[PDB]
Amino acid sequence: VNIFKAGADEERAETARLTSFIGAIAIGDLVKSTLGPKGMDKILLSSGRDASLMVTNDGATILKNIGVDNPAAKVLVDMSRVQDDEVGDGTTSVTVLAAELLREAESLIAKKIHPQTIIAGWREATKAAREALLSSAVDHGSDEVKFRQDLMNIAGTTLSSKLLTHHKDHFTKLAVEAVLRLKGSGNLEAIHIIKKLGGSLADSYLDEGFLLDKKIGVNQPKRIENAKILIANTGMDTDKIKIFGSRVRVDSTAKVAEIEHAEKEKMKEKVERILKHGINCFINRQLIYNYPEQLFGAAGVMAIEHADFAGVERLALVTGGEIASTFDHPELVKLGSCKLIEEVMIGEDKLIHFSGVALGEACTIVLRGATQQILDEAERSLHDALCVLAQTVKDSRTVYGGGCSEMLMAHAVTQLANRTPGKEAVAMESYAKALRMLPTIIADNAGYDSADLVAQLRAAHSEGNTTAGLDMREGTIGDMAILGITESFQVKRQVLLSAAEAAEVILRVDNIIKAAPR
Amino acid sequence: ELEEEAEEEQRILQQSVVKTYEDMTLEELEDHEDEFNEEDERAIEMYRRRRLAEWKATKLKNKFGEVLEISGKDYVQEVTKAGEGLWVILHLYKQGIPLCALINQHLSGLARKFPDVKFIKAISTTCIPNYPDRNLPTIFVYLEGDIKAQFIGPLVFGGMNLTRDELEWKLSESGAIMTDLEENPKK
Amino acid sequence: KIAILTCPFEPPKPKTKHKLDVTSVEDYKALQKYEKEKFEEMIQQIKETGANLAICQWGFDDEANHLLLQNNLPAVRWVGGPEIELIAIATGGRIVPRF
Ligand SMILES: Nc1ncnc2c1ncn2[C@@H]1O[C@H](COP(=O)(O)OP(=O)(O)O)[C@@H](O)[C@H]1O
Ligand SMILES: [Mg+2]
């Protein structure tokens, strides 16, 4: 007898894990074609309204854009998005590793092994692998030149799997420089990425100051030397007295004429109070109406209308001023400083160029490609590189990439498995196989002999050479210490832990109950 | 037009499906007077007594007058306890945006034009936290707090052609959403 | 020392509907002065209790935010009701409804 609903169903057997495994493997196979320096990106086309088209390489936006149906696919997409939020890298890596973990899981359950046995084996294996990765982590930060070289290597390895690889030598350092302007503040919003079409992608440059996409007023000057910027968050509009319930109730036209004259005079006195600070520039958050603009033009200052919260925050960071709202006491927290406020033209548009800024705490990156999709992909991948660089500035521990860290931690898992009895050992062996399946995939997407390369790496790591990985520009087994394929320790640790946790949570379901759709 | 009232006594019929005393309310019910027969008089007085009684009953309902002075701290009381069945038209705005100024002035005119529904107006920023500036002109109507229509957009609203069409768009609810656009189409 | 607070950092207004008639430029200037001194007195009254931090349930505006900044008195806004109650129970203060 059926009891649920019309449209509600239950899969309480091998069918449930069949659906979960096939969905996770579909996610893994879709994401798999975008790993390594030789990975190839994808086109996302919307069948709905506006037919949005986006060319992308990373797995986070690929998985979040598509509409997944299988709940396991939803689990993988959520894990990828969470991992992108946490660090900003390895979303494709974590999704692929989870997919291979589930594949080895179904292979094991074919051999009639209880899922909790696999769970215990995986817990022990991930503990050992995390311990080995932590033991193999190299650290810097005390050094200055060595840490800068490490940052350059991290940017290179993060940016080599994307389109900017075509000009990687130009871009990596640029990204590093941007992070070097943050001065340790974990504020990625201090970085502005302005994307304008036209010209090769090698024309992109990190500005030596700031760029604002706003407009000068009518009568204000359009160039200043030795700027004294005051940044404000005042009204400058009609500017109601804010006492709700106030109205003019008079008996003549002279009275209302006098009241409007008083309103204009109070606005004039507010502008005079602003000018008393000793300024030649003024940046406001919301609109500036016609009378304050006229007064500013007459006085001889420069005013900016409608610079949003992000704009004023970035100007405050790059110039050093405070966000003013009340100008009663000009002697309190002071202004900012620059050296030129020239208007500079890019493409066909004009932007305000703050040069000679007092502080480098914020900056702008100009992205200029030949196609809007190229601009979007460059922006997303540059965001990933900046995220990783900021994360490794916060925590300078690094581990070698190219599969070397994966190979060594898989070797540790294998060594632990060899000394553990029972059916746990095969679970840990499957864990190690799934973990080693990543460099296999990188070589496959590259197009080399994956089996030979992986066997060579296994032999080299078992011997003791703990810095061996895939040299992809030639396709052999090289030394990541000499070559310089580094990676953030935080990124790899988060990838491992998140993938293992998602595999564990998915594997222990034996019943899927779907309610009737709305 | 009042010009048809003086051209000639011959205005027999043109597009008048019904013509009786039952739909003459007050303004015109007292301009015929001598043309209302005599046998059907008592029915006319019964009808006028009933309809003036209904108007007197609605006098206790249609006294709101103009706009009022609600802010964020008074939102919950006047959107969840404002009354039973009384329409409330919440407005979220900020000073500086011109289109929302247009719709504010038109709403203010509507306030005296229609006193049955007392809409309330509130500042966008200090009514809901972190409201983006991309939703500067906001209007949503409801009764008993169950939000019915919450159209959002700076330019999709079309405050230039709002006047009567979107006046009744806000006014007419509890039924088909598309009910008054065909009256005053933009074309 | 935290100043757990409920009423917003905005000029007061009675719950009953009201109309403040302004009839001359002198009255308009008096209204401007009333607004300015209301903000200044509010901020100085927050400061005079010695609090290093304030918390308001109902949020506030820019002319208050700059005053809180320039007097070296950090504060947060738009804190929910239950959050206000939990803060009061934790930090040991008392919820006050008026400055
Ligand atoms: N130039 C390279 N040489 C060797 N291995 C690389 C190189 N670039 C990336 N890898 C490896 O490929 C894996 C995935 O890289 P990538 O596609 O950049 O991940 P994501 O798409 O999350 O940025 C990483 O674990 C890294 O070790
Ligand atoms: Mg990467």
- Look at residue A42 and give its three-state secondary structure: strand
Class of domain A140-214+353-395: alpha beta
Known binder of ligand: residue A91? yes
Method: cryo-EM
Determine the atom of ligand 1 nearest the C-alpha atom of A442: 12
- Token pair of B82 as six digits: 């404002």
Question: Coil, strand, or helix at residue A232?
Answer: strand
C61 contacts in chain A (CB < 8 Å): 242
**How many Cβ atoms are within 10 Å of A380's Cβ, its own excluded?**
19
Instruction: Specify the ligand 1 atom closest to the Cα of A492.
Output: 25
The answer to whether residue A247 neighbours chain C at the CB level (below 8 Å) is yes
Mutation site, C5, C6, C9, C10, interface B, largest B CB count within 10 A: C10
**Contact A92 CB / ligand 1 (< 6 Å):** yes
The CATH number of A215-352 is 3.50.7.10
| Strands ordered across the beta sheet of A349-355 | A209-212, A349-355, A343-346
Q: Using an 8 Å Cβ cutoff, are A10 and A99 in contact? A: no
C56 backbone dihedrals φ, ψ, rounded to 5°? -115, 140
CA A310 to chain centre: 17
In degrees, rounded to 5, the angle at the alpha carbon of residue A456 between the alpha carbons of residues A452 and A460 is 170
CATH topology of domain A9-139+396-516: GROEL; domain 1 (1.10.560)
Chain C nearest-CA distance from A250, in A, is 6
* A306 conformational bin, left if phi > 0, alpha if psi -120 to 50, beta if neither: left
* C20 chain-A contacts, CB cut-off 8 A: 243, 245-247
Min Cα–Cα distance to chain A from B70, Å: 9
Please list, in sequence order, all residues whose beta carbon lies within 8 angstroms of the beta carbon of residue A199, skipping any fewer than 6 positions away. Answer: A368, A369, A370
A233 touches chain B (CB under 8 A): no
Radius of gyration of chain B (CA): 22
- Whether residue A259 and residue C19 make contact (CB cut-off 8 A), yes or no, is no
CB A451 within 8 A of CB A435: no
Give exposure, A328-345, as e/b (b: 16+ Cβ within 10 Å): eebeeeebbbbebbeeee
Question: A237 CA to chain B: closest CA distance, Å?
Answer: 6
Using an 8 Å CB-CB cutoff, list chain C residues near A234.
Answer: 62
Nearest CA, atom 4, ligand 1: A402
Degrees to nearest 5, angle at CA B56 with B163 and B107: 15
Radius of gyration of chain C (CA): 15
Check CB contact of B61 with chain C, cutoff 8 Å.
Answer: no
Written as one string, the DSSP assignment of A300-329 is: T-EEE----HHHHHHHHHHH---EES--S-
- Compute the distance from residue A76 Cα to the ligand 2 centre, in Å: 19
Question: Which residues lie below 8 Å from residue A25, measured CB to CB, with a gap of 6+?
Answer: A99, A102, A103
The CB of A488 under 6 Å from ligand 1? The reply is no
Long-range contacts of B156-159 (CB under 8 A, 24+ apart): B157/B99, B157/B103, B158/B186, B159/B99, B159/B100, B159/B102, B159/B103
The two structure tokens encoding residue A246: 């106030």
Taking contacts as CB-CB distances below 8 angstroms, the residues of chain B near A289 are 96
Residue B80's contacts (CB-CB under 8 Å, 6 or more residues apart) are B144, B145
Ligand whose nearest atom lies closest to the CA of A473: 1
Q: What sign has the CA pseudo-torsion C34, C40, C46, C48?
A: negative
CB A307 within 8 A of CB A315: yes
For residue B121, count other CB atoms closer than 10 A to its CB: 21
- The size of chain A, in residues, is 518
CB contact under 8 A, A326 and C67: yes
3-state secondary structure of A117: helix
| Adjacent-strand bridge partners of C2 | C53
Out of 3.40.30.10, 3.40.640.10, 3.30.70.1050, 3.90.320.10, select the CATH number for domain B68-173: 3.40.30.10
